[PDB]
Symmetry: C2
Subunit: 325 residues, 2 copies
């Protein structure tokens, strides 16, 4: 009842406009909502609970497939029920092929500790940040993302370096990073996207955030990230991606081409142009697809990793059956 | 003349024994002076006779030290000058157009040789005058070995700009250390590294500026040892590479047309004689010249301006004759 109306409000907020802007807020709200779902709805066996979770997660994902934090948090919860059921009652590999009613409290405590560990991902990333920045380095970022801004603005407490931020047109939110970071004395620079390659030779390394990392190591980021990665590969400069663990989602690029997110073309082309708006077709995607071959490293709350290892993290977070959801 | 033969013998002995003169510019000037004396203080009637004499002297000088090409380049330039003078005094390139369309010489040749010396004199300043347009403030420039042309280039550039220079010593002949002091005497904030570390530091280098010993026809280079590795690292990081090379260093030969392209010296520098027993089985090689393919070269800078490697064939065609690549 009350939980149902809260779920409906959450779905409507996702459909219209994200209230809690930070992805961490999305993860915390999704986990809390799943907590009241588990506590309130009645179930005898784990199967009906799993299918109810499948239905609710399907509804929430269908509300807005552009962002996948809700989806992979739901998948993590489903794996939590699977693990708890296997523990209280009793991974695909060649070894497997050759060889061969009180869990509610355990589920609740698992979700609680998941929230506790999710709280400190930013702090862990900041703690390990200092080992990848040396004095008088040149760093370039794209758009706005709180992870990398915390990264740099804490790693500059003991080091001095230069930072270049390219505005992510049309949503010129790189200016926000520039202002916030220059309010910490970092000697930053504000730049357009069209100049990326023009300056890319004189950059030591490039650190970027992301919105979602796929299974193959390819990621979905803000528009223009693919061009930056291509320039990096051309100049062979290392590329660092700062992404917490919950931004890892088990889908794959070729899925119905509902991958990008197209917004109103008002930002790209103002409505004041007039007559020419009929014969002209305008596209304003907000996300770009970066292949895994252009990525050098992954920094998460657990440490450093290579893209070629990303698949393993998939097996430790999501059961293969719950990919389709 | 007796003194002409004396000077020829002294020159060939100096070339074949060791170094001298110190700078390739001085060697080219001495070769041009010797050739001028040969042309003046000798008897000859037909242009063919003079060309045969010049060819014999050039063959002898090249056989004295094949690894040194400046003498051969000067001889071929003199031969081309003789050909042009005879052609435009008697009559009036090997192109498709030519395919489809079928007494006072000595003074003119001497005047042309004097013009060649005059433009040789100011080659270093001609190269260094355009340094300011290739360096920006707070740049990082990496250099290998020892080269007076690059030294003058960087000194001229540093007059009105500030940047950092990283020099890799060219082991075993660690002549880069001279850079290490010389640029330091100009206050350019230089750093010294062993030449085992190029790639390790290479990612932090904005541009690489190097000299060379010889430029081949296809656009390749004969440089100091390890320059091939530096060029490979530059190509890997796609950092632009600059070859400060005067005009007189364009040999019309080709890389694999011959051997002894590398020059081998005593292995004492690499491995000292004090090792003793292990030297009795160990084979040691100390090549002092390395081959740089033209693919890894981004730009050539000469006393006439900048050029791409793909255009080198034209310049080599504008200074020599195809029938003189055999000498």
């Amino acid at each position: 009842s009350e939980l149902s109306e809260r779920i409906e409000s959450f779905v409507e907020t996702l459909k219209r406009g994200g209230g809690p802007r930070s992805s961490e807020e999305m993860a915390r709200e999704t986990l809390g909502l799943l907590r009241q779902i588990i506590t309130d709805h009645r179930w005898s066996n784990a199967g009906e609970l799993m299918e109810l979770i499948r239905r609710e997660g399907r509804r929430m994902t269908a509300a807005q497939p552009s962002e996948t934090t809700v989806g992979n948090m739901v998948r993590r919860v489903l794996k939590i029920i699977r693990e708890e059921y296997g523990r209280l009652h009793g991974q695909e590999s060649l070894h497997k092929l050759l060889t061969s009613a009180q869990l509610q409290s355990n589920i609740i405590e698992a979700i609680n500790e998941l929230l506790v560990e999710l709280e400190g991902t930013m702090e862990n990333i900041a703690a390990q940040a200092l080992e990848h920045i040396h004095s008088n380095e040149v760093i370039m970022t794209i758009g706005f993302s709180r992870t990398v801004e915390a990264f740099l603005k804490e790693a500059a407490r003991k080091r001095k370096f230069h930072v270049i931020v390219a505005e992510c047109a049309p949503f010129c939110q790189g200016h926000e990073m520039a202002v916030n970071l220059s309010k910490a004395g970092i000697e930053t620079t504000v730049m357009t996207d069209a100049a990326i390659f023009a300056v890319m030779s004189r950059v030591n390394k490039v650190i970027i955030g992301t919105k979602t990392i796929l299974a193959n190591g390819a990621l979905r980021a803000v528009t223009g990230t693919h061009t930056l990665a291509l320039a990096a590969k051309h100049h062979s400069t290392p590329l660092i991606v700062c992404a917490p663990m919950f931004k890892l989602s088990p889908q794959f690029p070729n899925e119905e081409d509902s991958f990008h997110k197209f917004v109103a073309p008002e930002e790209v082309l103002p409505f004041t142009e007039g007559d020419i708006l009929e014969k002209v077709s305008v596209h304003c995607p907000v996300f770009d697809y970066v292949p895994p071959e252009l990525i050098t490293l992954f920094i998460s709350n657990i440490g450093g990793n290579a893209p070629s290892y990303i698949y393993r993290l998939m097996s430790e977070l999501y059961h293969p059956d719950d990919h389709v959801l």
